[PDB]
Design an enzyme around this catalytic site. Structure first.
Site, short mmCIF file in Angstrom:
data_model
loop_
_atom_site.label_atom_id
_atom_site.label_comp_id
_atom_site.label_asym_id
_atom_site.label_seq_id
_atom_site.Cartn_x
_atom_site.Cartn_y
_atom_site.Cartn_z
N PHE A 1 0.77 -1.21 0.17
CA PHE A 1 0.00 0.16 0.04
C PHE A 1 0.80 1.22 0.09
CE2 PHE A 1 0.68 -0.56 4.41
CZ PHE A 1 0.89 0.77 5.29
N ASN B 1 13.49 13.82 1.91
CA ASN B 1 12.58 14.15 0.76
C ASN B 1 11.10 13.59 0.98
OD1 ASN B 1 11.72 15.33 -1.70
ND2 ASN B 1 12.64 13.32 -2.91
N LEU B 2 10.20 14.24 1.26
CA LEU B 2 8.75 13.97 1.54
C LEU B 2 8.09 13.77 0.32
CD1 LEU B 2 7.75 14.79 5.02
CD2 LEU B 2 8.45 12.59 4.26
N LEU B 3 7.42 12.62 -0.32
CA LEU B 3 7.06 12.61 -1.37
C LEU B 3 5.35 12.69 -1.24
CD1 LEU B 3 8.60 9.74 -3.47
CD2 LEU B 3 9.00 12.13 -3.90
N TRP C 1 6.58 6.17 -7.74
CA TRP C 1 7.75 5.64 -6.91
C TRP C 1 7.58 4.25 -6.77
CZ3 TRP C 1 9.76 3.45 -2.34
CH2 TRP C 1 11.08 3.32 -2.33
N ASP D 1 -2.43 -2.08 8.00
CA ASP D 1 -2.77 -2.00 6.49
C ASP D 1 -4.00 -1.26 6.37
OD1 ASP D 1 -3.57 -2.25 3.91
OD2 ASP D 1 -3.35 -4.46 4.01
#
Length: 312
Positions: free
Chosen positions: A132, A151-153, A161, A220
């Site tokens: 997930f 680096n926060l996506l 990614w 999850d």
């Protein structure tokens, strides 16, 4: 597990250990009515990359072996993956995560005790990879989010990614499925338009009751909804189709940022069981490590360095 150009003869170091394989109840409900029920064995994998005294990144993966007489249903669940960002990033993170996750998927040297010396597993394996994507700031490393080089996506970037990484390590698998609960078909397809082997949907049984088709994985987003279905004892009414329909309206998805579910399958893989000496620990030792990890300030080089030296 990792190529020479990343470890560089000790410039970088790894933490890697497994739990001793442990019998558990099936994460997919199996009616006691079923014939030839499987035994379920769970193994936890923890990986971290170190640069001298500091943690660079981490990955936690759970492997579930559904052992039948003639084959194994092998579920590989990515629990957590995170970066620290205390140092300017030297390796592309996917060049580490990809190979480590591929190693874990294909690892077949588990020392499994007999169900009440070591059990021999069937050679035929059916693989399932379950991931997930949800852009949480700190999956593993507390207070790392305000580190200078983390680096926060955002959600869509994180999904792109993961699709790239998973495609790279599932070449030739039978299916690659993407679902973005609450998104239209058109929005979901844009993420996989350049991935010829990928399609919209999920990898589990399509009909019948949701709890007999969908695995309950710890921590999850999908599992959190399944948990509610079970605690309210709606496990006998909830279908697979209605489960995924209502999943889209859960707060975690409807208020989330491109929260997505990926599943990949490979059927009828002939495997050979292959000893590969790795560090194995009791579940208590594993949990002790993870509990210490939660108490580390990963914005503080002193605490990170102390955590690493204590592990050594």
């Amino acid at each position: 597990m990792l190529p020479p150009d990343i470890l560089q003869n000790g410039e970088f170091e790894t933490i890697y250990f497994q739990t001793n394989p442990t019998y558990i109840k099936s994460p997919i409900h199996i009616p006691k009515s079923t014939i030839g029920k499987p035994d379920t064995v769970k193994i936890r994998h923890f990986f971290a990359l170190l640069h001298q005294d500091l943690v660079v990144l981490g990955l936690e993966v759970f492997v579930y072996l559904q052992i039948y007489s003639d084959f194994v249903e092998k579920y590989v669940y990515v629990s957590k993956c995170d970066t620290v960002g205390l140092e300017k990033s030297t390796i592309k993170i996917g060049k580490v995560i990809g190979p480590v996750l591929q190693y874990i998927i294909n690892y077949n040297g588990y020392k499994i005790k007999m169900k009440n010396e070591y059990r021999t597993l069937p050679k035929t394996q059916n693989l399932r990879l379950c991931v997930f994507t949800k852009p949480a700031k700190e999956y593993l490393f507390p207070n790392s989010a305000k580190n200078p080089y983390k680096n926060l996506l955002n959600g869509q970037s994180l999904l792109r990614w993961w699709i790239s990484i998973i495609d790279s390590i599932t070449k030739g698998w039978n299916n690659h499925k993407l679902m973005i609960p609450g998104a239209d078909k058109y929005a979901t397809r844009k993420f996989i338009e350049k991935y010829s082997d990928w399609s919209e949907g999920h990898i589990f049984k399509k009909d019948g009751l949701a709890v007999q088709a969908i695995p309950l994985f710890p921590d999850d987003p999908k599992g959190r909804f399944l948990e509610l279905v079970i605690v309210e004892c709606r496990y006998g009414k909830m279908t697979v189709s209605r489960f995924y329909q209502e999943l889209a309206y859960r707060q975690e998805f409807l208020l989330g940022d491109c929260v997505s579910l990926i599943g990949c399958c490979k059927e009828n893989l002939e495997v050979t069981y292959h000893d590969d000496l790795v560090s194995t620990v009791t579940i208590s030792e594993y949990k002790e490590f993870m509990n210490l990890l939660k108490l580390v300030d990963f914005s503080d080089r002193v605490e990170v360095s102390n955590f690493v030296s204590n592990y050594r």
